[PDB]
Each structure stands twice: as C-alpha cells, then as structure tokens.
C-alpha cells in the first residue's frame, strides 16, 4: 500500500532526527529504503487509469529513483560512520516529500 509506505518514511525520518545512537538511524534508513522501493511499484489515485508506460507513470517511478538515491546516500554515510552527516542528509527527504504531495495530492 502507498499511503502506508509514506507513513513508514515520515515516521522513520522523525526517528532519525530524534535518534540517540547510530543503530537507530541506520535501522530507520533501512526501513525507509524498503518503503520507498515498495512505493515505486504502486500507482496513486491521480494516475489510477493511466498506462504503466505513460509519461505520468514514468515520472512516478523516476521520482522514487531520487528518493531511494537520497536514502542510499544517507545509509552509506551512516554505514561509514558519518552518522551526523547521514542525519543532515535525511533532512533533504523533506524537500523530496514536499514535491510528492505537491504533485499527487
């Protein structure tokens, strides 16, 4: 489900911001990556009856290539011990998220 997937991402983002230990932020990012990759294969209401090959659906899955890439970025920083950097990196997903709500809701 798409709306669940975003609940995951929004919740776990908060977990990173509020985190006390590096294990928290890495486990959060890992959860966010799956939800993101999960959402990419969904189709939202505004494109209910659009072809999977259409521009709109190409755009949908393309945007998630950014969101996953930005997550992957934060995950790599965390896995490399740049854990403060991984946290700042994750703040960027708010911009990505705003572009989603703006376009599909």
């Amino acid at each position, epitope marked *: 489900d798409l709306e669940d997937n975003w609940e995951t991402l929004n919740d776990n983002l908060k977990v990173i911001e509020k985190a006390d230990n590096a294990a928290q932020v890495k486990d959060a990012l890992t959860k966010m990556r799956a939800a993101a990759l999960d959402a990419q294969k969904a189709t939202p209401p505004k494109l209910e009856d659009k072809s999977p090959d259409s521009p709109e659906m190409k755009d949908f899955r393309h*945007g998630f290539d*950014i969101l996953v*890439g930005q997550i992957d970025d934060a995950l*790599k920083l965390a896995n490399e011990g740049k854990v403060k*950097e991984a946290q*700042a990196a994750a703040e960027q997903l708010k911009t990505t998220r705003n572009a989603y709500i*703006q376009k*599909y809701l």
Partner: antibody
Amino acid sequence: EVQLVESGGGLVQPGGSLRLSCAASGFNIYYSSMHWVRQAPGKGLEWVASISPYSGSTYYADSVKGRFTISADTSKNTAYLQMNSLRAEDTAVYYCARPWYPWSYWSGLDYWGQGTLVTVSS
Amino acid sequence: TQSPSSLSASVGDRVTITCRASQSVSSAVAWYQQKPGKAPKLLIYSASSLYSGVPSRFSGSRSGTDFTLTISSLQPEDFATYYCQQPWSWGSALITFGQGTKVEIKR
C-alpha cells in the same frame, strides 16, 4: 579553499568520444556530489549529470542519457564526464560544480570549475 | 536551445526577475550571476539566503508558484546575466536552470 580545475575539452568529430576531467583540490571528492553543467555558445545553463562518489548514486539529463557517463577516481581526486556518440548540439562550454554538502544540490551549486570548450564538428 | 531574455535598466534602478515554477515553489531554489567568459556565481541559495560576499542589495524571495531575484539599486558591476535554479518536481531531472536574463545598460 575549494578549487575545481577542468581539462579534456577540445575538438572531436560527430560520433567521436571525449573525456572531460574535473580535478578537485581542497576537499575529498569521495564525500561530495559532483555535477556537470554545460552551456552552448550563446545559450543558457543546462544541467547534464551528477555523481555522489561515496554512494555511487548517479543521475543524467535526458539529452545525454545513454551517451554520457559520469564517474570519479578518488585517488586522483577528480571526476570525469565520458562523452560518447557526440553530436553538434553537444558543442558547449562544460562546467563542473559542487554544492556545500554532498546532499545540498537543491539549495545551490557553490563551487564551479572554470569550464572547458568542446567543439563537435567534422 | 534557448537564448537569454534581455532587459534594459539604469544604474540605481530597482529590478526584480521572476522565475515560474509548476507548483508551490518551496525553498530549494537558487540564483546565479554570470558575466561573459566566466562561470556563474552563486548569489542566493535556499530561495532567500545571501551567499557570502554578495552585497545586501541582492535579495531573493518566494510567493506562491513564483520566486524572485531583486536588486534594490543596480550598480555598474551588476550588469550581467542571471539564472535561476528551478525547484525539483517529482519525476523531473535532478537540477533544472531557468532561461536566463541579461541586464543591459540603458542609454
């Protein structure tokens, strides 16, 4: 002080190949996002590709997708733009740029190379 | 593909350049300055933040689906071309630059 010094531009014929260099000094190119931005004679800035070396995440404009290939060599501390199947419309001054933090590209590109001219012509 | 727009103004003039976004422009936009032969310089980052060493007569604001670069009093060395970095939209290319605006001396 962050410095980006480019090289590799020059002449090439349609369909040829050419590899641009963006040599970085003042920071470790591993932890950054490097971007190529080009500008055809008399026209505007067009973003082309970017790479986050440490993570390998890579992005491309549609106009060069499948033909260009951005990369980085951290030991040499430089990023590259491999340009294959070139055409006349690829004639431009090519810049490399980098944001403040590896993840702040959407806020602006702070540092720029000086640019190198690429002329595609037979 | 596109050539810069042009605009004539005198020293001391107030000029405001507008870039148009396909949605609520929100924060992650930038403004660059470029003079001939030279790379662009970052002027305004994050919609309204003044980059270092940029005079305070430059300012950047944002309203609805538009965002703006304002030069409160054009100085001779502000005649240049100005570029905006469009806000990302879902599915778009990672970075997109606006058309470009060349400010020239009225006489």
